[PDB]
UniProtKB/Swiss-Prot annotation:
Species: Klebsiella pneumoniae
Phenotype when changing residue 220 to A: Strongly reduces citrate binding
Cellular compartment(s): Cell inner membrane
Name listed for the protein in its UniProt record: Sensor histidine kinase CitA
Signal peptide annotation: none
Location of this fragment in the whole protein: 47 to 141 of 547
Posttranslational mods: Autophosphorylated.
Length: 369
């Protein structure tokens, strides 16, 4: 029965507690790219409770025939920091200590593709992740086999045309919802919240804020800021002139790129404003959009990364990721969310072999509860 048996107790969220504390990491990767064979091996520590990890990789066969930035994504998502209000969504630790396998396909726009089969298991009390990468149909004089990429990482860039267009469309579309303009006008916080929480369905923008005609917040991601007044001083141009714009200013959440747009009734008076924003922090970050998978019991993940080519522009890399657990123990399949990565490519001043020193910060955000 429910008393004749597991340890744990009596305050956690899963047996995946191996990561409280700094955990040793070990990883190899057997690589083939259009014939060019090579292999990488890396040591380093990883402290999931701070989301950070530092590692050093070494190409044990000679000169690495591809750019080091191209292998950063395939060379330990266990070490993401899921906050205590999201720890019921860490599918990566869920598979520990039994482990999960991690298969990914990486399309380099204008060139070839990486196809990686990996498994992140445990060995003793040290984390292991051995990969087999296969690269197909790469232009020999291309940016990858021609080593024409910069040694940064890298990434989401830059200034900020794409998401600015995206942030404003989200704002205006929300502010023309017919039930929303009736909602704001009656100051129905309940109906306002029930119309907007389904917005943040798959998380993307950091916040969606709705003000009344006086800038008083009627909806905010942090609920103890409802009824407070929006911060930034860049919402008169919407609340007074009924025109919608992009703006960069410091709100309750720090520096913020936000698209603002008025809410109009049938007359054309502005009854309020919506503000969709992205933190300047999260805009300088790589975001891995992961959703749960029932047919395979696991997750899928979609994201892309830019690779600044030196002397040129950008070589984009589109990633399609899918994870399946090794041991078919119990589950932990998460609702829609993402992880924000910040990584830095260094060099060991005393190593001479072709290598890479990677410091990486990853945080789980998307659900505000």
């Amino acid at each position: 029965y429910d008393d004749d048996d597991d340890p744990s107790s009596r305050m956690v969220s899963k047996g995946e507690e191996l990561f409280t504390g700094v955990v040793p990491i070990l990883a190899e990767l057997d690589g083939d790219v259009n014939g060019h064979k090579f292999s990488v091996s890396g040591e380093g520590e990883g402290d999931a409770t701070y989301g950070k990890l530092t590692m050093k990789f070494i190409c044990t066969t000679g000169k690495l025939p591809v750019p080091w930035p191209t292998l950063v994504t395939t060379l330990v998502q266990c070490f993401s920091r899921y906050p205590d209000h999201m720890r019921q969504h860490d599918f990566f630790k869920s598979a520990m200590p039994e482990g999960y396998i991690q298969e990914r396909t990486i399309f380099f726009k204008g060139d070839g593709n990486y196809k990686t089969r990996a498994e992140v298991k445990f060995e003793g009390d040290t984390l292991v992740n051995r990969i087999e990468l296969k690269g197909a149909d790469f232009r020999e004089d291309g940016n990858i086999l021609g080593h024409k990429l910069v040694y940064n990482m890298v990434t989401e860039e830059r200034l900020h045309h794409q998401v600015g267009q995206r942030a404003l469309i989200q704002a205006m579309q929300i502010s023309t919802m017919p039930e929303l303009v009736e909602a704001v006008q009656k100051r129905d916080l309940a109906r306002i919240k029930a119309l907007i929480d389904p917005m943040r369905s798959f998380p993307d923008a950091t916040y969606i804020t709705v003000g009344d005609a006086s800038g008083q917040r009627l909806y905010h991601v942090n609920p103890d800021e409802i009824g407070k007044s929006m911060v930034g001083g860049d919402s008169d141009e919407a609340l007074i002139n009924a025109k919608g714009y992009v703006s960069v200013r410091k709100g309750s959440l720090g520096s913020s790129l936000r698209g603002k747009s008025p809410i109009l009734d049938a007359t054309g008076r502005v009854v309020g404003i919506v503000s969709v924003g992205y933190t300047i922090e999260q805009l300088e970050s790589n975001l891995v959009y992961i959703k749960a998978d029932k047919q395979k019991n696991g997750i899928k993940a979609n994201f892309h990364v830019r690779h600044n080519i030196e002397d040129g522009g950008v070589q984009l890399a589109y990633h399609y990721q899918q994870n399946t657990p090794i041991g078919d123990g119990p589950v932990l399949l998460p609702d829609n969310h993402y992880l924000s990565v910040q990584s830095e490519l260094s060099k060991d001043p005393n190593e001479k072999r072709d290598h890479m020193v990677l410091q990486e910060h990853v945080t789980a955000a998307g659900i505000t509860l």
